[PDB]
Write a protein that binds this ligand. Structure first.
Ligand SMILES: CN(C)CCc1c[nH]c2cccc(O)c12
Lengths: 53, 262, 338, 228, 221
């Protein structure tokens, strides 16, 4: 019962939490990827001169 | 003609074995590399030597136009035949130590041992075949007889067979006896299959190559026309071993059977 | 009384499910539909690292994006120079059974862990010019599954005792213990800000942990089977998990739910490792089918494949500057891809 | 960590002598070993023995007459000298070095033993006036560029305080050696290198040597002295 | 093209390669064994001549054997079993005396046998405490025929001890044979709580395992 009480306490703590829209989260992730697309060498093939490998 | 069939079978079988060894990641072990070396030697035998022999048959055993090709042709024939013979001898010797002392053989088994094995067999084959171009081209009589390309050095034909198919043959029968002694004195089904495969391989090797060497020695130590006609067919009986070696050394595996069917 | 607590636990889970469902209005796939695809991603193996004589279990890039450490069944920790292929150090291990290795962000330490239930910390830079064990961290009742340095004096670990721990290396004792998982904890990923971290366990759930508070802030459950791998998005507001259910799933911290699943009918093998590219547009996953798949994280379309390993890919690592990807495998070779 | 040199003293010209350097407190097998100083001159590199003895180099001055060896089980390093000339007279130093990514070659030197019987590295000033608490810059120049395609510039700085053996300050033109305060700073460009000491103190006095490790033979600057 | 320091680093890497190769050559000599007994099996006691994860080493016929027992982990061993996918053999120890837990032993053995990672590894099964089994069956107070219908009517392939022992052996051998792959073999041995010769039997089964691997690599079988 003590284990169940601890479980219910942690479950209450998880339940009472701030949440945002999934659309807002998707837009934020898309914005991050758009902003950092140029910095990513794997996404775009890189010229051999700047390639260390 | 059933000689083009022989060359086609040799080429196709050895190419398929080499492809199976090269294309499969599960078949890259120390034994399969030596098996690939055997396949390479048999393919070279079947490509460079055998069709020229069929051409010699087609002209009534009269040599084609370039006379210089006779000595090098005999060189290649003896070289590849010896390479195959002591490849088989090395396989039998390696299997004897793999069966008698499995733990020590596995402990000492390495890529270096396989490379040493390959260079040893090829070095002995090169040493056996060494005098043919040294003396075959220096004197045309030693490689020609009655207008047909064949070696006519009595001393070499007698001793050169005593370290190519009679000391290797003695080694192979002793090794076969010791191995069948070792495999017999749920796991017994594997040993029985191994004994059956060893017996088939050994007896096919003996029955295909021994007739040619026996009549070759009889042609020297002793009829001439009959023995020559017998040699003309027994040399091709021996050549057919190049088309039989891959199948009997690889097709007993399910990986090789799947690869041949791919 | 017990039935009352069980009812409360069930109703709270139902309320959480309804709340997450309320937060969902449009899907990430729907929103990312009118975006250009990444296109075919073709990567070649720039370098192959040889010297491990057995299976490789773990690799970790150093912060300079040139040094990396790898752990193998042969009982050796080797630090490589990825640019020249040179071996910097070879560290003999007391126990041959290793399941994780880590590289300190400073570069002065590496950590190793396995079935001996000890996280061992090694001093790379020391007078007398050899690597030595600076500290052996005991206190776990199960095998060490993952370790990640926070600082030179702090390391977090996961273990087979269904628990994670935070250690003070100088003192050598756990300063925080994280206890919410039912199954063995397989994987662990620190957030970029280091204040939080995620871990996946054999109970097929992922948990978000507060490093300072020591509590489970959130729990995520979409996978049907155990989570072998976990990685945090470069933003730090999302993470991806890999399982032997053969799916990869992306979860959001703020929305508190799955955003997408990366699955194909052709693939039935389990995911051993996952990693993100610098932008986070690419999600690379190693599989038990001896190959690694490149996924478009925003569209969940497989952009490409890394196919060079004879055996299963154990570990994945995208270097800090984003230039290269390392993949260790049971075939005993690490390959650097670009 | 410790290196102690034995052997030396008066030798008639044309004689032979063997020096010994015994290593204590470090894994001597992993370090490559190397240097002499004439009684009133700067540093001159003599020989190198790699870890495992796979490589040996000598200065052209001593080639054919000096033999360098190491006894790894005893952790001893030796230098067998023959046909000794008057120009050989010097204090010979035993120096440890290790070569991997991020290492610091020439970090520890021995006390040395006294015997009495090419890139040109330029240090324009032989002396520099200095007062405590004031920043001072010491320059060195190279005949060719020490910048390499890999991105390293193989330039080193050493400090020999009075009555002491040299001590490494900066390795590869910018990296501060361990146990050295943040006051010392190394900056430079290809063929032009400067060492800036800021907030100067007593015990910073001595001769500052610039050395290149781009290519063998290793060569030193003449040395610039700081005097209060 | 390569600097002096890079050349020295390459020399260092070559020396490291040489040391790694020497260590691997030293390691290849030893044969590795995994010991897995569920409980009350005498698995610590089976090999008593030579004395998170425990290890013991013994030598027979100049062959090194290293045996691993993992006592640290919890009861279920599923996750870390992938590590021991290269061992020469597994040694499974079972208490044949305990009839009630005998089905649990069978389930454990079946789980190990059918594991995806251990498909190619043989098992050397040691049936421990055969003297306790003999005492119990001779006394006859507890009978497996009562609980188990199969022993009530059983034809053997004292005589009661023989019937019990061969039935118990056949229980595991049926599970081993059910796969029928032939890539790996179960080697069942009936062992007492104290047995002078157990390392000899382990050595013989390991020799047979290596022999079968040799026959498979040579394409003979
Ligand atoms: C004819 N050809 C099948 C070559 C066989 C051979 C191998 N080694 C020899 C040595 C001497 C004379 C020979 O015919 C051989």
């Amino acid at each position: 019962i003590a284990q169940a009480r601890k479980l219910v306490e942690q479950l209450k703590m998880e339940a009472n939490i701030d949440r945002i829209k999934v659309s807002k989260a998707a837009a934020d992730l898309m914005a991050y990827c758009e902003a950092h697309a140029k910095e990513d060498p794997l996404l775009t093939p890189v010229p051999a001169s700047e390639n260390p490998f | 003609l059933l000689t083009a069939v022989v060359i086609i079978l040799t080429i196709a079988g050895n190419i398929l074995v080499i492809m199976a060894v090269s294309l499969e990641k599960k078949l890259q072990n120390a034994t399969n590399y030596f098996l690939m070396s055997l396949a390479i030697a048999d393919m070279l035998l079947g490509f460079l030597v055998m069709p020229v022999s069929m051409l010699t048959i087609l002209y009534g055993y009269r040599w084609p136009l370039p006379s210089k090709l006779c000595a090098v042709w005999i060189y290649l024939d003896v070289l590849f035949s010896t390479a195959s013979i002591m490849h088989l001898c090395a396989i039998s010797l390696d299997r004897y130590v793999a069966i008698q002392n499995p733990i020590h053989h596995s402990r000492f088994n390495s890529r270096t041992k396989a490379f040493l094995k390959i260079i040893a067999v090829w070095t002995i084959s090169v040493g056996i075949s060494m005098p043919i171009p040294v003396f075959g081209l220096q004197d045309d009589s030693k490689v020609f007889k009655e207008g047909s390309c064949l070696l006519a050095d009595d001393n070499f034909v007698l001793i050169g067979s005593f370290v190519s198919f009679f000391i290797p043959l003695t080694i192979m029968v002793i090794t076969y006896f010791l191995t069948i002694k070792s495999l017999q004195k749920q796991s017994i089904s594997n040993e029985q299959k191994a004994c059956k495969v060893l017996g088939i391989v050994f007896f096919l090797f003996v029955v295909m190559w021994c007739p040619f060497f026996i009549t070759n020695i009889m042609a020297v130590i002793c009829n001439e026309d009959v023995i020559g006609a017998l040699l003309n067919v027994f040399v091709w009986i021996g050549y057919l071993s190049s088309a039989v070696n891959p199948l009997v050394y690889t097709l007993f595996n399910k990986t090789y059977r799947s690869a041949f069917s791919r | 009384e017990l039935d009352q607590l069980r009812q409360e636990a069930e109703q709270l889970k139902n309320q959480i499910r309804d709340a997450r469902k309320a937060c969902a209005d449009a899907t990430l796939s729907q929103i990312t539909n009118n975006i250009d695809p990444v296109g075919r991603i073709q990567m070649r193996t720039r370098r192959t690292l040889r010297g491990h004589l057995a299976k490789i279990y773990a690799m970790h890039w150093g912060t300079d994006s040139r040094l990396l450490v790898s752990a193998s069944q042969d009982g050796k920790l080797i630090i490589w120079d990825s640019y020249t292929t040179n071996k910097v150090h070879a560290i003999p291990l007391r126990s041959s059974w290793v399941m994780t290795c880590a590289y300190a962000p400073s570069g002065n330490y590496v950590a190793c862990g396995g079935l001996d239930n000890i996280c061992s910390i090694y001093n790379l830079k020391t007078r007398e010019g050899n690597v030595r064990v600076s500290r052996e961290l005991a206190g776990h009742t199960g095998y060490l599954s993952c370790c990640r340095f926070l600082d030179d004096n702090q390391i977090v670990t996961s273990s087979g005792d269904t628990t994670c721990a935070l250690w003070d290396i100088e003192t050598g004792q756990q300063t925080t213990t994280f206890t919410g998982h039912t199954g063995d904890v397989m994987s662990l990923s620190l957030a970029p800000d280091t204040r939080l971290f995620v871990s996946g366990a054999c109970d097929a759930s992922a948990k978000l942990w507060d490093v300072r508070e020591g509590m489970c802030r959130q729990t995520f459950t979409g996978h049907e089977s155990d989570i072998n791998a976990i990685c945090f998005f470069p933003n730090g507001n999302a993470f991806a998990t890999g399982s032997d259910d053969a799916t990869c799933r992306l979860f959001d911290l703020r929305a508190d739910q799955e955003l997408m699943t990366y699955s194909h009918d052709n693939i039935i093998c389990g995911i051993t490792s996952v990693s993100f590219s610098k932008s986070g547009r690419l999600l690379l996953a190693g599989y038990d089918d001896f190959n690694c798949n490149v996924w478009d994280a925003l569209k969940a379309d497989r952009a490409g494949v890394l196919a060079g390993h004879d055996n299963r890919v154990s570990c994945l690592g995208v270097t800090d500057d984003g230039m290269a990807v390392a993949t260790g495998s049971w075939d005993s070779f690490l390959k650097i891809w670009n | 960590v410790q290196l102690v040199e034995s052997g030396g003293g008066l030798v008639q010209p044309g004689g032979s002598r063997k020096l010994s350097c015994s290593a204590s407190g470090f894994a001597f097998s992993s370090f490559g070993m190397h240097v002499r100083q004439a009684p009133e001159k700067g540093l001159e590199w003599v020989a190198y023995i790699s870890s495992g003895s796979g490589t040996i180099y000598y200065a052209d001055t001593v080639k054919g007459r000096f033999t360098i060896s190491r006894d790894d089980p005893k952790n001893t390093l030796f230098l067998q000298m023959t046909s000794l000339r008057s120009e050989d007279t010097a204090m010979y130093y035993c120096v440890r070095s290790i070569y991997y990514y991020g290492s610091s070659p020439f970090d520890f030197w021995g006390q040395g033993t006294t015997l009495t019987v090419d890139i040109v590295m330029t240090q324009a000033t032989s002396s520099v006036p200095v007062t405590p608490g004031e920043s001072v810059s010491i320059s060195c120049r190279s005949s060719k560029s020490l910048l390499h395609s890999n991105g390293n510039t193989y330039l080193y700085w050493f400090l020999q305080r009075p009555g002491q053996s040299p001590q490494l300050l900066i390795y590869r033109m910018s990296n501060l050696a361990s146990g050295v305060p943040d006051r010392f700073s190394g900056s430079g460009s290809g063929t032009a290198f400067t060492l800036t000491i800021s907030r100067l103190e007593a015990e910073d006095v001595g001769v500052y040597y610039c050395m290149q490790h781009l290519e063998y033979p290793l060569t030193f600057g003449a040395g610039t002295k700081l005097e209060l | 093209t390569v600097s002096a320091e890079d050349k020295a680093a390459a020399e260092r890497s070559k020396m490291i390669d040489k040391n790694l190769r020497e260590d691997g050559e030293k390691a290849r000599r030893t044969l590795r064994l995994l010991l897995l007994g569920a409980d009350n099996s005498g698995k610590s006691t089976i090999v008593k001549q030579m004395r998170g994860i425990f290890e013991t080493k013994f030598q027979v016929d100049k062959v090194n054997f290293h045996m691993f027992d993992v006592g640290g982990q919890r009861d279920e061993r599923r996750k870390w079993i992938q590590c021991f996918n290269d061992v020469t053999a597994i040694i499974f120890v079972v208490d044949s005396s305990d009839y009630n837990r005998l089905q649990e032993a069978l389930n454990d053995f079946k789980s190990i046998w059918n594991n995806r990672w251990l498909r190619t590894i043989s098992v050397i099964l040691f049936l421990n405490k055969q003297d306790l089994l003999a005492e119990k069956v001779l006394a006859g107070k507890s009978k497996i025929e009562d609980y188990f219908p199969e022993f009530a009517r059983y034809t053997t392939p004292d005589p009661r001890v023989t019937r019990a022992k061969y039935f118990i052996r056949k229980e595991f051998v049926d599970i081993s044979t059910a796969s029928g792959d032939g890539r790996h073999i179960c080697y069942p041995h009936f062992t007492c709580a104290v047995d002078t010769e157990n390392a000899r039997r382990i050595f013989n089964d390991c020799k047979d395992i290596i022999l079968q691997m040799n026959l498979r690599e040579y394409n003979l079988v």
